[PDB]
Amino acid sequence: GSVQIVYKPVDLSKVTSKCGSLGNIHHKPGGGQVEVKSEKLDFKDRVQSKIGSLDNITHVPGGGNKKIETHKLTFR
Amino acid sequence: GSVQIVYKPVDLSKVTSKCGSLGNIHHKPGGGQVEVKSEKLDFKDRVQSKIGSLDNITHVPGGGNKKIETHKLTFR
Amino acid sequence: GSVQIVYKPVDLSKVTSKCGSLGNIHHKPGGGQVEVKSEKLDFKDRVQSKIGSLDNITHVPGGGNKKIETHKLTFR
Amino acid sequence: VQIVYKPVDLSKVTSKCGSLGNIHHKPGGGQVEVKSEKLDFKDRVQSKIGSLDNITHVPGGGNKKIETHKLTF
Amino acid sequence: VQIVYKPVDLSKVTSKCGSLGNIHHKPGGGQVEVKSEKLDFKDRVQSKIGSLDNITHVPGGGNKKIETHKLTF
Amino acid sequence: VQIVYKPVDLSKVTSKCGSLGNIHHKPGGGQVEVKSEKLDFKDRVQSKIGSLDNITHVPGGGNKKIETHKLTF
Amino acid sequence: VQIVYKPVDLSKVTSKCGSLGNIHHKPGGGQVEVKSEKLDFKDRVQSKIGSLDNITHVPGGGNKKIETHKLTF
Amino acid sequence: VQIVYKPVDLSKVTSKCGSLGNIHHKPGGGQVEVKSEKLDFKDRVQSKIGSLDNITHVPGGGNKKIETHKLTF
Amino acid sequence: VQIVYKPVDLSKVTSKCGSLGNIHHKPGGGQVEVKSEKLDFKDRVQSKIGSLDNITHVPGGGNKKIETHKLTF
Amino acid sequence: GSVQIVYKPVDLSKVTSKCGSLGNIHHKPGGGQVEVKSEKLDFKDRVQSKIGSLDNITHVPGGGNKKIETHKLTFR
Amino acid sequence: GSVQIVYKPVDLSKVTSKCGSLGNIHHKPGGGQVEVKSEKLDFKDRVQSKIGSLDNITHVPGGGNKKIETHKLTFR
Amino acid sequence: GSVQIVYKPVDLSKVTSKCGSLGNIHHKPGGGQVEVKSEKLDFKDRVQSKIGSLDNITHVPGGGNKKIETHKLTFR
């Protein structure tokens, strides 16, 4: 029959960090020697060809203190 | 039949970082040597060819204290 | 049939970073030596080709404390 | 005949020398005391009381590179 | 005839010397005391009381890279 | 006839030498006391009271790399 | 008849009481340190840091003298 | 008849109490340190760090001199 | 007939009581250190760190002298 | 015969004191009871009669560093 | 016969006191009781009679660093 | 016969007192009780008579650094 829903999440969260110093972080990758020989390079569908490339990320957050909080409610 | 929905999500949160110093963060990738030989290069659909590239991200936020919150409610 | 919806999400939050100093953040990639050879190059749809390219991002926000809050409500 | 003289050099030569990358989180903080009726210093006396003296000499650290790409027919 | 002279050098040559990468988290913090009627120092005396000295010398640390690449028919 | 002279060098030549990578978590913290009527130093005296004096000399550490890629028909 | 009533009193009555005649040559001279992120005092807390607190209560020390020089014929 | 009533009193009556005549030559001189994230004091706490306190009480030290000197023929 | 009533009193009545005549040459001079995340005091705590707290209570020490020099013929 | 006298005293004297404090010096003498009975006091020559007297000196020099230096020379 | 007298007494002297403080110097003598009875007091020559006197000197010099020097020379 | 007298006494002297403070110097004598009795008192030459007398001296010089130098010379 009749419906009552009471939905009262209550959060008191301290998500913290207290870092004194981040030092001389060095990021220095090096590619060497790469060679490809062929009659064809022949790439059909969704091919990733990455020959001698470098992908480099230097992420240095002074705090990275991520919070995710997802809610839902449903009725029919 | 009646419906009552009372939806009072409460948050109190501290999402912090008391970072004292970020130092001499150095990012210096080096590409080396790369050499590709063929009669054809032939790329048809969604091909990513990266020969000898560098992709370089240097992300240094004094705080990256990311909060995501998400809500939904649905009725029929 | 009667419907009462009361929708009062509360947040009080401190999403902060008391960062003392950002140092000598250096970003210096170097592309090296690249060689590509063919009788033909033939690229069709959604092809990417990144021969010897540099992409560089240098992102240094004094705070990057991204908050997202998303809400929805729905009825039929 | 052909001669195809194509040497490749991608070398790196480096001298990281002195005081480098050291962290030094909070040196000091201790009490130091001297009490006297006389202090008397008179010839090439070096005196330090509670100092945090960082000092560095690098008369070295030098780099040398020589290459001689000679070719002759 | 052909001669294809293509040496490749990808060397790293490094000197890494003196004081490097040391953390030194919270040196000091200890009480030091000296008490007298006289302190009296008179020829080439080195005196240190409580000091957090870090003196460093590097007369060395050299690098020498030498190459010759002669070809002749 | 052909001569394909293609030496490849990937060498790492290194001198890591001195004081390296040490952690040094909380050096010190201990009491020191000296009491007198006189202290008296008069020719080449070295005197230390509660100091945490770190010191490093590197007159060595040199690198030499030599190559003679000679070719002759 | 004669009565020669001549009592002599040269008495001294004294209360030397409290802190008296103490010399106190150079109290103090020592380092004192407190370090924290929080200090929190909230009900009848008495706190002293390096103080040289001399204090003295003398609700006593009182003197009483009674004499009754009665004579009767 | 004669009565020669001449009592003599040369008494000294003394209370000498609390802290008296003490020399206290150079109290202190020693390093004291306290280190924390929190100090937290909440009901009738007495805290002392390095203090050269000298608190003194004298509720006592009283003197009472009573005399009667009756004569009768 | 005669009565020569001449009592002589030379008495010394004394209460020397408390802390008296002590020399106390150089009390202290020693290191003290405390390290924590928390100190937490919550009901009638007495806490002392390196203090040289001298203290003295004298509720006693009283003097009473009573005399009844009665004469009768 | 002929006379030469050379009289060269040479004095470099430090007579010192370095007193930090002189305390609560008390001087309190007390005479008691004294009685003399006689037919005569009869004093003829250089008599000192000192009956029940007090002679009191309270000398407290902050330094009392006395020097005496007496010289003479003579010829006939 | 000739006479030569050369009389060069030299003094250099420091006759000092670095006194920090002179305290509560108290001088309080008390005469008691004194009683002299006779048919005569009869004092003839150089008699000193002191009955019940007090002589009281309170000398408190911040320095009493007395120097006496004395010289003589004599010839006939 | 020839006489040469050369008379050069030299002094350089510091006769000092760096007195920091003179305190509560108290001088309080008290004469008590004295009784003298005779049929006669008879005093002749150079008699002194000091019955119940107080002599008091209170001498507190900030410095009393008395120097005497006395010289003489004589010939016949």
From Swiss-Prot, chains A, B, C, J, K, L:
Residue numbers bearing the Omega-N-methylarginine modification: 46
Modifications the protein undergoes after translation, according to the UniProt entry: Phosphorylation at serine and threonine residues in S-P or T-P motifs by proline-directed protein kinases (PDPK1, CDK1, CDK5, GSK3, MAPK) (only 2-3 sites per protein in interphase, seven-fold increase in mitosis, and in the form associated with paired helical filaments (PHF-tau)), and at serine residues in K-X-G-S motifs by MAP/microtubule affinity-regulating kinase (MARK1, MARK2, MARK3 or MARK4), causing detachment from microtubules, and their disassembly. Phosphorylation decreases with age.
Modification Phosphoserine, positions: 2, 21, 49, 53
N6,N6-dimethyllysine, modified sites: 8
Residues with PTM N6-acetyllysine: 8, 14, 18, 28, 40, 44, 66
Glycosylation sites: 44, 50, 66
Tissue: Expressed in neurons. Isoform PNS-tau is expressed in the peripheral nervous system while the others are expressed in the central nervous system.
Subcellular location: Cytoplasm, Cytosol; Cell membrane; Cytoplasm, Cytoskeleton; Cell projection, Axon
Covalent link location (Glycyl lysine isopeptide (Lys-Gly) (interchain with G-Cter in ubiquitin)): 8, 14, 18, 28, 40, 44, 50, 66, 72
Written domain comment of the UniProt record: The tau/MAP repeat binds to tubulin. Type I isoforms contain 3 repeats while type II isoforms contain 4 repeats.
Summary of the function given for this chain in its UniProt record: Promotes microtubule assembly and stability, and might be involved in the establishment and maintenance of neuronal polarity. The C-terminus binds axonal microtubules while the N-terminus binds neural plasma membrane components, suggesting that tau functions as a linker protein between both. Axonal polarity is predetermined by TAU/MAPT localization (in the neuronal cell) in the domain of the cell body defined by the centrosome. The short isoforms allow plasticity of the cytoskeleton whereas the longer isoforms may preferentially play a role in its stabilization.
Disease listed for this protein: In Alzheimer disease, the neuronal cytoskeleton in the brain is progressively disrupted and replaced by tangles of paired helical filaments (PHF) and straight filaments, mainly composed of hyperphosphorylated forms of TAU (PHF-TAU or AD P-TAU). O-GlcNAcylation is greatly reduced in Alzheimer disease brain cerebral cortex leading to an increase in TAU/MAPT phosphorylations. Frontotemporal dementia 1: A form of dementia characterized by pathologic finding of frontotemporal lobar degeneration, presenile dementia with behavioral changes, deterioration of cognitive capacities and loss of memory. In some cases, parkinsonian symptoms are prominent. Neuropathological changes include frontotemporal atrophy often associated with atrophy of the basal ganglia, substantia nigra, amygdala. In most cases, protein tau deposits are found in glial cells and/or neurons.
Name of the protein: Microtubule-associated protein tau
Taxonomic lineage: Eukaryota, Metazoa, Chordata, Craniata, Vertebrata
Portion of the full sequence shown: 621 to 696 of 758
